[PDB]
Design a protein around this ligand. Structure first.
Ligand SMILES: *C(=O)[C@H]([C@@H](C)O)[C@@]1(C)CC(S[C@@H]2CN[C@H](C(=O)N(C)C)C2)=C(C(=O)O)N1
Length: 243
């Protein structure tokens, strides 16, 4: 089809190894310049915030209303030097807030929860607030896509209201009836560095298309390339048309 050519020609300009996986609940589809990335495991980086919020809410370690207060120590971004709810920190990808959450869960409960839900290789190592940024936790694009697909559907092994709350923490924008939810990632501490843009498009019809961009990153890259490439792809596929 011509839509496949349109999508592949998008990647034919990107000077970085990339894969974009889709999942409509039945078919996995892969596009990009290196399809084998879809089956390769990378650290989740900030996409792990999804599982971290789910585990923390499920296990009475935080609420979606609770305020995670700034402790006064300057964070990496001046924008992070304030108080956040888990929702607000999800949109800002505020790493220190989610590290505080991981420490509340603790390594024993984090480990057993990741085994219970089967998230990636389920390895956390010995630093409970570092494993998704430096390893040893890894996950494939195919695994990320089926994970967030189930989140959209309320079919993860979590309480239904916990999934609903984390689902709307991911809410980016709606276009007419169709809703985009997404979370970006950039694992800089590993080699190669890995970039993520994972999420799903919910139609008012109820159909869901989950997606995961996974691409190699270099220091200095355009931080906005992950989201703009994913939205380009979704429009060319006719999943999430530009308005
Ligand atoms: C998490 O994946 C990642 C760190 C822990 O490696 C994190 C939090 C840093 C960045 S880069 C920077 C933060 N948010 C900016 C952004 O996306 N915009 C548009 C302002 C860039 C990211 C990231 O995925 O961008 N996540």
């Amino acid at each position: 089809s011509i839509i496949d050519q349109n999508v592949q020609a998008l990647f034919n300009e990107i000077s970085a190894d990339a894969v974009f996986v889709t999942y409509d609940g039945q078919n996995i589809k892969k596009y990009g310049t290196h399809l084998d990335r879809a089956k390769t495991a990378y650290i989740p980086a900030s996409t792990f915030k999804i599982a971290n919020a789910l585990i923390g809410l499920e296990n009475h370690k935080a609420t979606s209303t609770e305020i995670f207060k700034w402790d006064g120590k300057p964070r990496f971004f001046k924008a992070w030097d304030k108080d956040f709810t888990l929702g607000e920190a999800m949109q800002a990808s505020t790493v220190p807030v989610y590290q505080e959450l991981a420490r509340r869960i603790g390594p024993s409960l984090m480990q057993s929860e990741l085994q219970r839900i089967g998230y990636g290789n389920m390895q956390i190592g010995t630093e409970v607030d570092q494993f998704w940024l430096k390893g040893p936790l890894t996950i494939t694009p195919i695994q990320e896509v089926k994970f967030v697909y189930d989140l959209a559907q309320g079919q993860l092994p979590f309480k239904p209201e916990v999934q609903q709350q984390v689902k709307e923490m991911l809410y980016v924008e709606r276009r007419g009836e169709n809703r985009l939810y997404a979370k970006s990632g950039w694992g800089m501490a590993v080699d190669p560095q890995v970039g993520w843009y994972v999420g799903f498009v919910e139609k008012a019809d109820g159909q869901v298309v989950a997606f995961a961009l996974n691409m190699q990153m270099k220091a200095g890259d355009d931080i906005a390339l992950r989201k703009q490439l994913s939205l380009d792809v979704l429009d060319k596929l006719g999943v999430f048309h530009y308005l």
